[PDB]
Design a protein around this ligand. Sequence first.
Ligand SMILES: [Mg+2]
Ligand SMILES: [Mg+2]
Lengths: 132, 154, 131, 66, 138, 199, 100, 101
Amino acid sequence: KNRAARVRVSKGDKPVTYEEAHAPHYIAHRKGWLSLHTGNLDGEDHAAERTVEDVFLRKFMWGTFPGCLADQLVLKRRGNQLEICAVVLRQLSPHKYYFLVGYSETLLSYFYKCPVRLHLQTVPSKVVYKYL
Amino acid sequence: EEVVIPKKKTWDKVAVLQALASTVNRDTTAVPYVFQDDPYLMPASSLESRSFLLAKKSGENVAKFIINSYPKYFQKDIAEPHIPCLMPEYFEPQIKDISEAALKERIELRKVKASVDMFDQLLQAGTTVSLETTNSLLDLLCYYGDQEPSTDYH
Amino acid sequence: TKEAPETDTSPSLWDVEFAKQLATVNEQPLQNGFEELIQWTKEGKLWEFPINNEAGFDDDGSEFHEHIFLEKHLESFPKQGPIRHFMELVTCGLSKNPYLSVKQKVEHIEWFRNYFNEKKDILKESNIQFN
Amino acid sequence: ETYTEDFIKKQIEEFNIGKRHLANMMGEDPETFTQEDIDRAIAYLFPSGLFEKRARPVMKHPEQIF
Amino acid sequence: VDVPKDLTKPVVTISDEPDILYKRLSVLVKGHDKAVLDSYEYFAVLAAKELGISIKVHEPPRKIERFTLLQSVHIYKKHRVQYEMRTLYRCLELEHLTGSTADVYLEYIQRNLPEGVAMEVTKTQLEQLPEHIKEPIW
Amino acid sequence: ERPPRRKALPPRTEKMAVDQDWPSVYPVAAPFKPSAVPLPVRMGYPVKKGVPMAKEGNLELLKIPNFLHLTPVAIKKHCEALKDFCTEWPAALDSDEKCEKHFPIEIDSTDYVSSGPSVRNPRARVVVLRVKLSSLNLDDHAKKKLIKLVGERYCKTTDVLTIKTDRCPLRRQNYDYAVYLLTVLYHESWNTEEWEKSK
Amino acid sequence: SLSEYAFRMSRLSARLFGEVTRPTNSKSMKVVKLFSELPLAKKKETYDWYPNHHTYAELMQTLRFLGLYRDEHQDFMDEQKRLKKLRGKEKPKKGEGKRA
Amino acid sequence: HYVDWRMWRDVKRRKMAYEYADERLRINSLRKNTILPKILQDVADEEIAALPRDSCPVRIRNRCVMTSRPRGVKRRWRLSRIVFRHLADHGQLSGIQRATW
Ligand SMILES: [Mg+2]
Ligand SMILES: [Mg+2]
C-alpha cells in the first residue's frame, strides 16, 4: 500500500484541510503547488538553491509563529521579490502579529539579500474540508 | 533616399513606475497601505493606528539589533547586483593604532567618548593633530553636548 | 548668489544633520503598492527593469581586445621553441575563456613566467633557452 | 451541511451583487453580462491549470452550485 | 471629492542621440501552467495594441521531462515512482519597434510577469555597415 | 481576560460600490485577499453532495497567480500614461526589404528574466551578427576568399554570413568583437597574397 | 590531404578567428581546453554544493535563546534529557568515566 | 552542525580542492602535452603528486545536502531520492508532479 503524504481514514472524527486531504497523484489535477518559482522550468538554473530556501522558510515560519499557522505556506517569487502568504489564526493579539511581521520581513531580507514581504490572512478556525 | 531615425527618449529608473502610479487614486474603503489588509489585523481606532505601526517598527528594530549583534549570520551575499543596504552595519572602530588617522575614524563613527579619550591620549603622546581633525572633533562634541548618541542597545 | 560653492570641502556634522531634518519634513508612510516598489528601486533592493543580466557587473571596464589578444604578455618568453608553442596554446585557451577576468588571465601567464625561470637549469639540459 | 432556503436566498443576492462588480471590473455593461462572460472573466482573473475543471475557480448561480 | 488637483508627471527628456531600431522582439515565456500563459498573453497583446505595437502570438510545442525514482526506501527495485515537469511556451513576436518603445513595453510586461513564469527576449537590432568596411584600405 | 476577544471587522467588500474604480483596489500584483475582492468565487473539488469551498481561508485561490491588478480597464489606463515614453518607428522602413537595404546588419541578443536573488545569466553574453554578402562591396575575388575563410558561417541558400561571438564576459565586448571580426574579414578578403596563385 | 591553397587559407582563418595556428596534435590540444573553462573545483556548483549548515544551525540556535524561535525538536530532546537525569541515566564526566 | 562526520569530511575536501584548483590546473597543463621536454614533465608529475590528497577533485562526493546520502541523489536538486520524494509528494517543489502517460 502507498503511504506518501496520505492522511488515513479514521472513525470520521479527524478534521483535514483541503491540502492534506489530497494524495500526491492530485498535485496537478485538484491541488496546486505550494511554491511557484522558475527554477524547475526547462533551461532554468538554481533549482537547488531555491529548494533549500523553501525548506528553511517553512521551518522558520513554523517556529516564529508557533501555534498560529492554520495551513501550509504559499511561497511566491517574482523577479527579486519573495512573498510569503500565510493563513494564520485569530488567537494571538494583533500587536504581536505586527511585531512578528516587521521582525520576520527584516530578518529574512538580510538573510537572503532580497525584498521579502509577509502577507497574513486570518481565519477564525482551521478550515475543515472533510472529516476522515 | 534617406530615412530619419527618431531621437531617443531617456527617463529615470523609477519613471515608468511613477507613470503607472499616477493612474490610480486612493481607495476609500481601505485603511492606509502600511497596515495589514485583513479584517482582524486592520486598525479599528486612532489609537490602534499608532500602536500597530509602533509594534511593526519595534519588530524591525529587534531584527536590526540581531543583525548587527551577529553579523556572521548575514554575510553570505547571494544578490546580483549587490545590495549594500541589506548588509550588516559595523559601528565599531577597526583601527586600533593610536594616531591622528586612526582618530578620524572614531569621529566618523560618532564615538564621542572614544574619540575624546583617544584625542587626549594622542595629545599626551605629543603627536600632531590637524586643526581640521580637531575641528571635526569639536563639531561632534558641540552637536551632541558631550553625550553619546542614542543606540539600539548595549 | 555665490558664484562657486565649496563643493570639494566635505560637509560638517551640522550640515549633514540639517540635511536629515529637511528629509523628515517630507517623510510620509508608503501610500500604495507602487510607492513601495519605487522606494525599493531607489534603495537598490529591487531590480531595475527592463531586466539586464549584467546589471552592476563590469569586468573592470576591459575591452574585447584585452581578453582576446594576450600575446603582449608573452614578450618576456622566448620568441621560438617549445615553450613558445606551449604558451601559445595556453593563451589561446585563456582568450576563449569568458569566466576569467583579464587580471586572472594575466596571473596564469605570470605564474608560467616564474615556473620556467625556476626550471631554467632543466630547460638548459634539454637544449631549451629561457630568458 | 444542510442549506436552508433563507441561506440560498442570501447566496443569490450575493451572486447578483458580485455579478455587477465583475462587469465593472472587466469594463462591460452590467445589464448584458451573461454567464458565458462571467466564466471568461473568471478564467482570466484566476488562471488555473488544474486538469480537472471541477477543481478550478467557479462563479455560478447558487441554483446551479448547491 | 478628495481628488488631487494636479499630478506630477514623470519627466521624459528627448535626447540628442539617435534611437535604436529593433526589427523584431521575440518574447518567449515558459510556464508550468497553461491558463496562466493564456492570461499573460491576453495582457501582453492588449498592452501592445494600446501602445501601437505590432504583435503576433504563436504557441511553441510543450516539453515534458520525465524521470524515475525508487518507491521504497530499501530494496523492492521493481517498484518505481515516476515524476514529470511540464514546460509550456508562448512566443510573443513584436516587430518594427524602437529602442524607447521596446524599453517601455518590456519593463511593463516584465514587471507583471507572474510567479513561476520565465522569459527570454531575443532582440534583433537593425544596424548599419561600420565605417571601416565602406571601402577597402589596400 | 478583561474584555471579550477581539472581533474581526466585517469585510470591506461590503462597503464597495458596484461602480468603483477597481484599479485603485488592486493597483499592483498582490495575493488574493478574500476580504478585498467583492466576488463570491469558489474553488476546490467538491465533496459528494457538496459545493466548491468558499473563498475565506481558501488556500487554492491563494495559490493562483491572479490578474486582478491587470484588468482591461487598468491596462488601457496604464498604456495611456506610458505613451509619452514611446518613440515613432521610421515610416520609411515599411517592409523588411526596405530595412535590409538601409540597415544591412542585424544584431541578436537575448535577455533572461528569472526569479531569484541573482539576475546573472551566462547565456546573455552571446551576440549574433548576420549580414548578407550582397550588401557588402565585394568583388569576385574578395567574395570567393571570404566564403572560404568563414567556412560554415556562410549559408549559400540565404547568402547570409552569421558571426556568433561568446568569447568575452560581457555582451558589449562580444558585440565589439563581432564587429571587429567582420572588419578584418572584409579587408583580409580584399588583400591578395602571393600564395593564392597556387589555387 | 589538403592542397597548399586550402592549407594556407585554413591557417589564415584560424589566425583571424583566434584558433590554434601552429600544427598541434590532439594530446597537446588539451592545454587549450584546460584554460578555456573553469576547473571543476572552481565552479559554484562544486564548492557551494552544501548550504552552510553552521550558519543555519547557529542562527536558529541563537534565535531560540533570544526567545524569537520555538524549536519544537530541541524542546523534545530537552524534556527527554531532563527525564533521564531523574532516572539516573546521566552523561558521565569526561575522563572520570566508568572505565579507567 | 553538518548532518554527519562524512558530510563534514566532504565539506573540507570541497574547500581544499577550491583553494588548490588554479595551482593544480597550471601543473596539469605542463603534463598534458607532448611539446615540453619529458624532463620538465617528470618534475611536474612529482609536484602535483605532492599536493595534499584532499585537493584532488575526484575525491569529492555529491551527497544529499539534507541527509548526507551518498547515492540516489538527483544532481539538479542535490537531494536524495527519499528526501526529494518527500518534498515532491507534498507539493512543495515548483512544477513537479507525478508522471502518468
Ligand atoms: Mg505498488
Ligand atoms: Mg566520485
